Amino acid sequence: MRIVPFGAAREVTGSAHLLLAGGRRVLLDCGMFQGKEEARNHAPFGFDPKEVDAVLLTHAHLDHVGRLPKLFREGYRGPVYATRATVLLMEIVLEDALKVMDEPFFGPEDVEEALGHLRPLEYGEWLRLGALSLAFGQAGHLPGSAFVVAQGEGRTLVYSGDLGNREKDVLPDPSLPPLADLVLAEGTYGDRPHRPYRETVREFLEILEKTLSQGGKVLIPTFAVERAQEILYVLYTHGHRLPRAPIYLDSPMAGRVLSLYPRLVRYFSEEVQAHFLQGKNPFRPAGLEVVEHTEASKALNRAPGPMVVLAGSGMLAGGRILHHLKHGLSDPRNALVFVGYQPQGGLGAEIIARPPAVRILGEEVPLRASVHTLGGFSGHAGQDELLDWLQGEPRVVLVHGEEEKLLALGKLLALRGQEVSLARFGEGVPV
């Protein structure tokens, strides 16, 4: 048994790993590259799609399923396994990616072909392929997210997929992995742990009361898939002590995801499920409003506070959020609250440097509004959690992370007596 990295080698996007064992070929994830690596979605996979026996998707995010339609576009016609939740979220993600994408590397017929071969596989359910046995484990990173357990030829491999941040409340705790001959694991935060969750919420709430009590606007850049709904959840469970104000989920996509959430109840933590049992949707805080079009979105820029605004892109790459910043950063009564990692050299970082001004949408805008970064809202396991999850595993191959972050984790794992390396693109690793 061998595992071949075909994405996320010393980088965080493009996750795709070819599992070779028993004359069978199983692709573990098929994500697109993003940001500065976007063009690479137009390049070859590195393997022959037509020879793939099956595909397992760990979660619906674009950097894990974005190239799936390219796979079908190039011949593949085998099954694609994933949890019901992922299958459902995928439709929303892929349909949107198709529409909202400068240079497309796939057409609408490919998305249809992809969606049509999706087959549900829940946690604890074993898929048989030749002498190979596969199963999903709880990853706690997204509704329906998982890590993969592959056992065959008398050996065991575990592909972590993306591990969640267990301190948070919306998703169930990641399950520990079984003891394995090899663990292919992410190390996004291989270099550090996150600020504790609870104190992150307290701080989040203090910022809201302060800003809303004075009539200002709280701008929150957010990813549409799960981060936005999580903020909504915090607003729900604490709205009782926050000043009344409209909550604008200024993201059609996030709205569609939110709508799907009631059908995914079993994929949330016990806490969330219990809320649903009492007949209530904890992702709909009072005052919630979904802004569907540009006109209402822009109008918000001119309307006075108090108000809470959630918009994308989550990394200020573009989107409606840029317009809210352009018109709201110059007011000291407002507040910009990051709840998701900001890339180095991006607009976020620039703002965090707290310079006199910033250039947004071709204009120099004064930065008077307060700024806050709440890394505790992160959706990935922090360094400490990564070490706990990896505890006792003899061999670890790291993926999904910047080289240095990955090295930082490897060093600690090595000092712990665990064999580790940083996966290299196209280079098979024996299990």
Ligand SMILES: O=c1ccn([C@@H]2O[C@H](COP(=O)(O)O)[C@@H](O)[C@H]2O)c(=O)[nH]1
């Ligand atoms: O594009 C879609 C959306 C939903 N469903 C199906 O509609 C039913 C209800 O969805 P859900 O309750 O499982 O979320 C399920 O049997 C599901 O497979 C589809 O086949 N295709």
Ligand SMILES: O=c1ccn([C@@H]2O[C@H](COP(=O)(O)O)[C@@H](O)[C@H]2O)c(=O)[nH]1
């Ligand atoms: O040091 C980091 C931390 C996170 N991320 C990326 O940014 C996203 C946001 O992660 P988070 O805000 O949930 O922590 C992740 O999906 C990942 O691709 C990085 O590139 N480097």
Ligand SMILES: O=c1ccn([C@@H]2O[C@H](COP(=O)(O)O)[C@@H](O)[C@H]2O)c(=O)[nH]1
């Ligand atoms: O170190 C390796 C080992 C296998 N493969 C890939 O595995 C498939 C063939 O497997 P096999 O004939 O080595 O068993 C090919 O698509 C090839 O790209 C690699 O890329 N690198």
Ligand SMILES: [Zn+2]
């Ligand atoms: Zn992810």
Ligand SMILES: [Zn+2]
């Ligand atoms: Zn990822």
